[PDB]
Design a protein around this ligand. Structure first.
Ligand SMILES: N[C@@H](CCCC(=O)O)C(=O)O
Ligand SMILES: N[C@@H](CCCC(=O)O)C(=O)O
Lengths: 505, 502, 502, 505
C-alpha cells in the first residue's frame, strides 16, 4: 500500500504550522518530539515547559483574568468571533495537522475543525445571554435576583483523539464567560495545539485583548499534574480515556468537568431498518479507527435478526478501505501507536477465550508498508454473553455482538457496564423508541433513536454518567460550569426584621 | 430560672409520641439524647451499625426502582401530604428543635415553617423539572434534553439546623424521583426520628413505597459507610466527603460553613446597621453557617459604630430558649464554649481589644450548660484568628478607607458563603455585587449575612464547598441530564458534514 | 328515572349555602338559574348593571394598588388557603357543576380537582415568576429583565367548564399581583357565586384586600362593559373581544373553540384507538373545546374502524349525570339540540352517511331536556359542515392514504386547538409533531384530543385565538416585562460606539 | 452654513446603492421618488409596487416558507451569518444611505448599522437554541414536552427614523425562526431598504437558500394596508410613530408586535451627578434631532436643583453644533420634512400659551442655506404643570422641564402620560434607584438608572406599555413572538383511561 513518508508528512506539518502563524524556530527544541501515527515516526523535536513554567503560566493567566472579568461579555464575544473567522480561513491547514497527529481521515479532520467554528458561533450568541434570574422575594420592599460571574483560570486537559475540538468547546465558552485558559494537550499531539494557540494569539492582538487569555503548556505528565494541583485554577476540565483528577481537585475544593471514556452500545430491534442500521453502525464502530470515547463497541441485536445483521456487518467490515488518511479513498487510518495495537490484539484473544467468535477483521494491514505504524481492520466479534472483556473499554475498533429477546433485557445489557456515555436504539416501533429513552431506559448521558453513539452536534450538552465522570461541556447551559452563581437580596425599605421585636437603636 | 431536665425530658417524650414515634422501638443504651439547655442526657437510644446502613441503602434502592417511574406530579402529592402533617405538628417539632439544638422558640418555629414552605415549593417543581427542546442541524431529526431520577441520596446534617436542611434535600429529592438515607447529627437524633415518623405516615396515606426515606442513628462509622456506598450516587453534606465520593465517581452537594462579613460604608443608616448586625452575629448564639463574624467598617464611622455595638451587646437578653424574652440561648456543648474562649484569647494576643461580651452567664443556674454573652472584638488587621471561623458568637471589627480594599478584605478568607453591604450609595451597592466585588455565593445590600429564602439557591464558594440547595434550579443536582437525538428521516446524516461513504 | 327539578333545586341551595353563599342577598327576579338535567328554571337571581361593572372594576383597581406591592410568596399563601377550602367543599362545588353544566359526576369532580391542582401549581409559581439577568456591552453597567403586576383582569368563561377556566385565570393572576373581575356564562351563575364565596372566605382568613375578586352576574351588556373598560389591561375569554380590546391597546387571551381531529394509521392499535376516540368524541356530550370531531382514518382499515365505532356508539349509556352508570349526559339546551340536528341534516345532504346515533333519548322522561346519542357520520370529503364546528357530539370519519394528506386534512380547518395520531410507527409519530406536521397548539401521539394537563400551556392557533392558559410560562401574559439597565460607572457610555461629544 | 448640494447627495446615494449590489436601472422609475432631508429635495424617481404586487410577493414568500421551515435552524443561522459579514463589509456604504434619507449624523448612522450586525451575531447563536421545554406528566408511561415551530410570512412595517435597524431586528430573528419576510419601508426611506435587500439577496445566493426569503415592497399607504390585511401573514410587526394595525390584524385572528411611540421622561433627584445627568440628557433629548421613539421629552427635576439644571441645559443646548450631518463637527442634523417643523413650532407656541417659558432653542437655523430643509436648535421649555401639550408626543426636539418634591410625585408625573416606552432616573441614592424600578415605580417597558431614555442595546427585549402598544422585539426571548408553541403529550404505555371504567373493545 502507498503510505506517505515521514519526510513528506513533516513538510506538510511545517507548512500548516507556518500558515497558522507558528514561529517554528521558537517552538523547536530537543526536550520532546512531535510524531505521526501514519508512520509511527518522530517528526522533529520541541521545547518543553517545566512544572515551574506551568505555575508561571497560571499566574499570568490570572492577571489576564483580573482584566477580562470586567471586560463586557459582548466584547469578549467579539474576540471569539474574530477567532472563528481565523479558524474558517485556516480550516484545511488545521485539518492537515489533525490528520498528521491523530491519524484521522480528511473528512473527519475537517469535521472536527468545523466543530470549533460551530462552537465559536454558539459562544458569540451566548455572550449576550449567560442568563441568571430575577424572582419574587417574600420580604416587602426588597428585590431578589441570581447573577453569574466569571470564575477564574480554567485548566484544560485534552487527549490525542480530538486534539482541537475539545479545547475549542472549553476555550470558546470559557472566554465569553470571562475566564482565561491554560491548556495542557496530549503529549502525542502538541502541534495541533501550537497552531490553535497561534491563531487565537492573532485574534487577541487584533482585538487588543489581554495577552494572557490562553496559553499552551507542552510537556509530559509532571506538567499536567502541576496544572491540576494549582490553587489558582478553580475549574479543571479533563476529557479523554484522568481518573485521578476528580478526587485531587475535590481535595483542594476545586471544580471539575470530567468525561473519562465510554463503552457504548446500540440496540437493534426486529423492526429496525437494516440498511440504515448497518450504515450507522459501521461509522459508529469504525470511524476514527474506533478511537472515540463515543465509539460503538457493543451491538445488542434481537435474536430474530441476529444472523442477518452479523452477515451484513461482516461484509461491510470486509469492504472497508484501510490506508493513508490523506487519500480520499481511505475510510480507516491507523491506530495511534503500538501500545494501542497490543491492547486490541489482547482483547480479541481474550474474547475468543471467553467463548466468542471473530467474524471479521482484527488483522494488521500491510505491516511492511509502514513498519512503525499500525493499520488494522475493525474487528467484529460475536459473544455468547457480556463477559469481562466486553465490559472493559478497549480503545480500538472492536464491535461485540450480543443477542436478546425482551426489550427490558436489551436495556439491562446496555446499562450493565461501568461506563455511561452514549447509547442508541434502531427501531421503527414508537413504543420501543420511547421506552429506551424513558427514566428506566438507557442510563447514559446521550441516548439516541435511529442514530449511532458518536457524532454529536454542538447545541446539546455533551458528557456522560457513572464512571464516565458526570461532566457536561459544549452546548445547552453547560456554560454554567464555567461561572459562579450569586444570589442577591437587595433591601430598599430602610428597615430590617427586629429579632424578638427589640430595637437596639 | 432554667427549665428543669425532668420537664425537658417529659416534653421531648410527648413531642415524639405525638409525631408518631414508638418510644419503645427507638430507646436503647448505645447512644443518648441530650439537651444544651442543661447539658444533661435525656435517655438512651438504639443505634445502627454499618451493616444496618448497607441494609437501609438496599431498601432505599429497591424503593427507588418503583418511585422513579411514578409520575412526578404523583410524587408531589406525597410531599403535599407531608407538608400538611408538618403544619399539624409544627409546635411539637419546634419543641424538639429547641430541646436538642438550643435555639429560641421563635427560631425553632421558623425552622419548621421552612420545611412547610419547601414542601409547597417542591409541589410546584413536580410539574416543572424543566429540560429543553432545541433545533438540530440535521434534516428530519429532533433534539431534546431530558432529566431523570438519579437514585439513592445520602443526607448528612448538623446540629444547628436539625430539620430544615434535611427538608430541603428530601422534599426536592422525593419529587425528583429519588429516595433518601438520612444520617443526622449525633447531637440531634430526636428531631430526625420525629421527622421520619411524620413522613412515614404521609407515605402510608399515599400508598407509596415504604423505603422512600430512612434515618440511621449512629456514630462516625455509620456516616462513613453511607458516604462510601457505591449505590449512593449523590451525597449532600451540610455543616473528607468531597474527595471520597469523587473517588467512586459519585456526586456531592457541600455547604461546609461560612466566615461571613458585612461592609459598613460612610452613608450607612446606623440604626439599621446596628440592628441588622446584632441579630446576624448574636442570633442562634452565633451557630449559623450564615452567622455574621466580620464587620468591615469605614474608618470615619468606626468609633461610633463600635460604641453603638458595644452598648447593644451589653443589653442582649441571654437565657432559657423556651422564654420569649430570650434572644441568645446556650452554646451546644462545653467544647463549643472552650473553642470560643480560645479564639478570644488568641484575638487579644494578636493585637485585638475585647469591647464587650465573652463571659459565661449564670453558671450555677445550670453548671452543665454554657450560656455566653456574644463577644465583640476590635482588630488591627485580618489576622489568623479572624480568617478561620469559630462556631461561636464572636464579631471581629476591621476598618477600611477605600471600597476596593473592603472588598478585598471580604474576599480574602478561605470561606465564601455570604456577604452584605450597608450603604445609601447607589454605586457602592452595585460595585459590591459586581463581578469584581464580593466573591460569595450570597451577596446582599442593606440586609445581613443571613438574608436568604426558599426561592433562592443556597450555598457558597471556595472552601464552603460549591453546592447549592433549596431554590432556583438547585433540583438539577438531584437528577441526571440526558441529551436525546431522534432520527425520523430514514437516512444516515452525519453532523459537521462528515462523509463516511466509499 | 331522571332527577326531579325539586330535588335538583334543593341540592343546589344546599351546595350554595355550604360554600358560604347568602341566598337572600343573591336571589332576585332579573335572571334565572336553570338546569340542563330537566330544562327547568331553578330560581331567580339579582343581576348587575353596566354601572355595577364600572363600580366593580374601580374596587378591583383599588385592591390592585395594595396587592401589587404584597410580596408574591404572601400572595401565594392566599391561593394555598383557597385550595384548602376547595378541597373542603369539593363535592358541594361538583354538585353545582353537574346541575348547571349537565356533566357527569366524575367529570364535575375532576373539574373541581383541576382548580385545586392549579392552586398548588400557582403556589410554586409565587416564588418563581422568573425574569433574567444578562451581560451588557457597556463597562460598569448591569442589565436585567423584571416582571411586574399588570392590573385588573377581566375573565369571561363559558357554560361547559364553569369553574376550572376561571380557576386557571384567578390562581395565576392573583399570585402575579393582579385582581380579577369575572363574568361567568349566563347559563351557569350558581357555580360562580359558590366559587367567589369560598375565595372571599380565604381572603378574610388572610387579611387580604376585599376587592381581589368579584363576580358580575348579568346579560350581554354586562360583558361588553367589562371588555371595554380602560382600567382592564387584560381580558381572558374562553369558549368581537380581540379587536375591541386591541382598539384600546389592551391585551387578550383568547381560546375560542376547536374542531379537533385524530389520525388513525394502518399500524394503530384498534382497541386503544376505539376507546380513545369514543371518550374524546362522546365525553361531556361533545361539549368540550377539545372534543374530538374529525377522525381521519387510513383507507385500508377505514371499514373495520367504522364498524367498531358504530358498535360502540350504539352501546353508549345515556342518562342522568348524577348516575354513575351514565357516560353521556344532556346537551345544554334546546338550541344546542337544534344546531346538532341541522349539522347532521347538512352532512347527509353533502354526501355523508349517518352510521349511528343522532336520535333523542327518552323525551317523555323530561320533555324540557335534550339527551341525545352521539352521532357518527362517514363523509366522502372534508365538506363545509365538517370544517365548521358544531358544539355537539358529531364525529365525522374521513379517509386518506398518504400521511402528508392526513396532515393537510388536519390543518385545513379554520380552528387549531388540538390533534392526535394513533400509530405504532416511530417515524409517523415524529412526522405528525414536526414543523410541517399538525399545526395545532396541542399535538399528541396515541392519546386523544383532550390529552392535556395543568403543567402544559393550554390553547390553540388560527381562529382558536392564539392565547395560552394554565401551565409552562403562561403566567407571563398576566404581567408586564421591564428591561432595566443600571449605570454605576459614573460616566456616560453610549451603546454601539455612538459618540455625541463635540 | 455649508450644506451638501442635492446633486452631491444624489451621487453619494447612487455610489452606495451600486456598492451594495442594487441595479439602479432596475429600481428607477417615475411612480415615487427618493428624497433627502438634508436639502428637502427629491433625488430621483423609483418604480412602485401595486397592491396586487403585494399579494404576489406575500404568496412567493409563503412558497419559500414551505421550504425554509424544514431547513434546519443552524443552517438558517448560517445564512444570517453570511449576511452579517456583508453588512460589516458595507457598513459605511449603508451608513451613508441612512444619513441621506433619515438625516442622521455619521456616528449615529454607523451605530444604527452596527445594531444590524449585533443582532445578526445574536441570531446566529439563537439558531441553536429556540428553546422549548421537557417536563413531567401526571400520566404513567407518557412523556410531555413543549416545542416551537416556524410561523409563516412576517410583514414588517418600519418608519423613517430607524430605516435599517428595525427591519434587521425583525428579519434576523424571523429568518433563524424559519419565517420569511415581506418588508414595507417608510415612503420616506426606500433606498436604505433596497440596499439592505440587495445585500441579503447576495447572502441568499451564496448560501443556496430559497429566493423568496425576503422582499421589499416600495409604495404608499395602499401598499402597506394590503400587507396588513393579508390572510397569509400570521404576524405583522409595526414600529414607529400604525395605531390601526392592532385591531385590523386582531380582526383576522393574526398576531402583532406594536411599538407605536413614546413620551419619555427622566427624573433628576437632588443627589444626581449633574455633569453625568446633563451629558446624558443632551444626547437623549437632541440625538437624531429628537426623532426617536425613545427620545427624552420630559425632565422631572427636584425643586432644590431645578434652577441649576435648567441653567446648565440652557448653555448645553446653546452650544450644540447644528449643520450638515456628513460633517464630523455636526451633532444635530435636520428634521425629516416641513410638516415636522410645523408641528414643532405649534407645540412650542402652545406650551408658552399654557404658561411655559422657552429657555433655549426652537429656532430654524440658516434657512437660506437650504430653503427646502429644516434645521432647528433643540428647544428647552420650562413648564409650571404637566399640561395637554406636554402629555402629547411631538416628534421634534422639545424638552419640557417639570419640578417635583416627593419621589412618589415624580413617579406619578412619569406615569401620567398615555405612552409607556422608556424612563430613567439620575440619582446617587440606592433607595431612590430601586423605588423607581419597583412594581409601583415607573410603568414603562424600559426603566434605567443613571442612563437616559434612548440608546438600548440588542440583548434586551425592546418595546413598551400602554399606548406604546405592548410588543417586544430584538433580544431576550422576543423571538418567541415569531414562532408557534406546541404542547405534545406522547403515550408509550399502549393504553388509555377508560371512561367510567368501560372498555369498548
Ligand atoms: N463530536 C464527537 C466528540 C467525541 C469526543 C471524544 O471522543 O472524546 C462525538 O460526539 O463523537
Ligand atoms: N436603539 C434605538 C432604537 C429606537 C427605535 C425607535 O425610535 O423607533 C434606541 O433605543 O434609542
Amino acid at each position: 500500500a502507498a503510505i506517505s513518508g515521514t519526510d513528506e508528512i513533516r513538510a506538510r506539518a511545517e507548512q500548516a504550522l507556518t500558515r497558522c502563524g507558528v514561529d517554528l524556530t521558537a517552538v523547536k527544541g530537543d526536550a520532546l518530539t512531535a510524531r505521526t501515527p501514519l508512520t509511527g515516526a518522530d517528526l522533529f523535536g520541541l521545547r518543553a515547559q517545566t512544572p515551574e513554567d506551568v505555575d508561571r503560566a497560571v499566574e499570568a493567566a490570572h492577571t489576564a483574568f483580573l482584566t477580562w472579568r470586567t471586560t463586557p461579555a459582548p466584547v469578549r464575544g467579539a474576540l471569539v468571533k474574530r477567532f472563528g473567522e481565523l479558524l474558517t480561513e485556516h480550516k484545511q491547514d488545521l485539518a492537515d495537522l489533525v490528520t498528521i497527529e491523530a491519524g484521522k481521515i480528511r473528512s473527519e479532520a475537517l469535521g472536527e475543525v468545523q466543530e470549533m467554528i460551530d462552537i465559536c458561533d454558539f459562544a458569540v450568541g451566548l455572550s449576550r445571554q449567560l442568563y441568571g434570574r430575577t424572582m419574587p422575594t417574600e420580604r416587602p420592599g426588597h428585590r431578589l435576583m441570581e447573577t453569574w460571574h466569571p470564575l477564574g483560570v480554567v485548566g484544560v486537559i485534552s487527549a490525542f483523539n480530538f486534539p482541537v475540538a475539545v479545547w475549542a468547546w472549553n476555550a470558546a465558552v470559557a472566554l465569553v464567560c470571562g475566564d482565561t485558559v491554560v491548556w495542557k494537550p496530549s503529549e502525542l499531539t502538541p502541534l495541533t495545539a501550537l497552531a490553535c494557540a497561534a491563531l487565537l494569539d492573532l485574534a487577541i492582538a487584533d482585538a487588543g485583548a489581554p495577552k494572557g487569555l490562553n496559553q499552551v503548556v507542552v510537556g509530559a505528565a509532571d506538567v499536567g499534574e502541576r496544572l491540576v494541583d494549582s490553587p489558582r485554577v478553580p475549574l479543571v476540565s479533563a476529557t479523554g480515556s484522568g481518573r485521578a483528577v476528580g478526587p485531587r481537585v475535590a481535595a483542594r475544593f476545586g471544580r471539575t468537568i470530567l468525561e473519562l471514556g465510554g463503552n457504548n452500545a446500540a440496540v437493534v430491534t426486529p423492526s429496525a431498518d437494516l440498511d440504515l442500521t448497518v450504515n450507522a453502525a459501521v461509522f459508529a464502530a469504525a470511524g476514527t479507527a474506533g478511537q472515540r470515547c463515543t465509539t460503538l463497541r457493543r451491538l445488542i441485536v434481537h435474536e430474530d435478526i441476529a444472523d442477518t445483521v452479523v452477515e451484513r456487518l461482516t461484509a461491510a467490515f470486509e469492504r472497508l478501505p484501510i490506508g493513508d488518511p490523506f487519500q480520499d479513498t481511505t475510510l480507516v487510518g491507523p491506530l495511534v501507536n503500538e501500545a494501542a495495537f497490543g491492547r486490541m490484539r489482547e482483547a480479541v484473544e481474550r474474547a475468543t477465550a471467553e467463548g466468542g467468535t471473530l467474524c471479521a477483521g482484527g488483522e494488521r494491514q500491510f505491516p511492511d508498508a509502514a513498519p512503525g505504524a499500525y493499520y488494522v481492520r475493525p474487528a467484529l466479534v460475536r459473544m455468547p454473553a457480556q463477559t469481562a472483556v466486553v465490559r472493559e473499554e478497549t480503545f480500538a475498533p472492536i464491535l461485540y455482538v450480543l443477542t436478546y429477546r425482551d426489550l427490558d433485557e436489551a436495556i439491562r445489557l446496555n446499562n450493565e457496564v461501568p461506563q455511561g456515555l452514549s447509547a442508541g436504539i434502531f427501531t421503527a416501533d414508537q413504543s420501543e423508541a420511547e421506552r429506551f429513552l424513558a427514566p428506566d431506559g438507557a442510563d447514559c448521558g446521550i441516548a439516541n433513536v435511529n442514530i449511532g453513539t458518536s457524532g454529536a452536534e454542538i447545541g446539546g450538552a455533551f458528557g456522560g454518567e457513572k464512571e464516565t465522570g458526570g461532566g457536561r461541556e459544549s452546548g445547552s447551559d453547560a456554560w454554567r460550569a464555567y461561572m459562579r452563581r450569586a444570589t442577591n437580596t437587595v433591601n430598599y425599605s430602610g428597615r430590617v426584621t427586629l429579632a424578638q421585636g427589640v430595637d437596639f437603636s
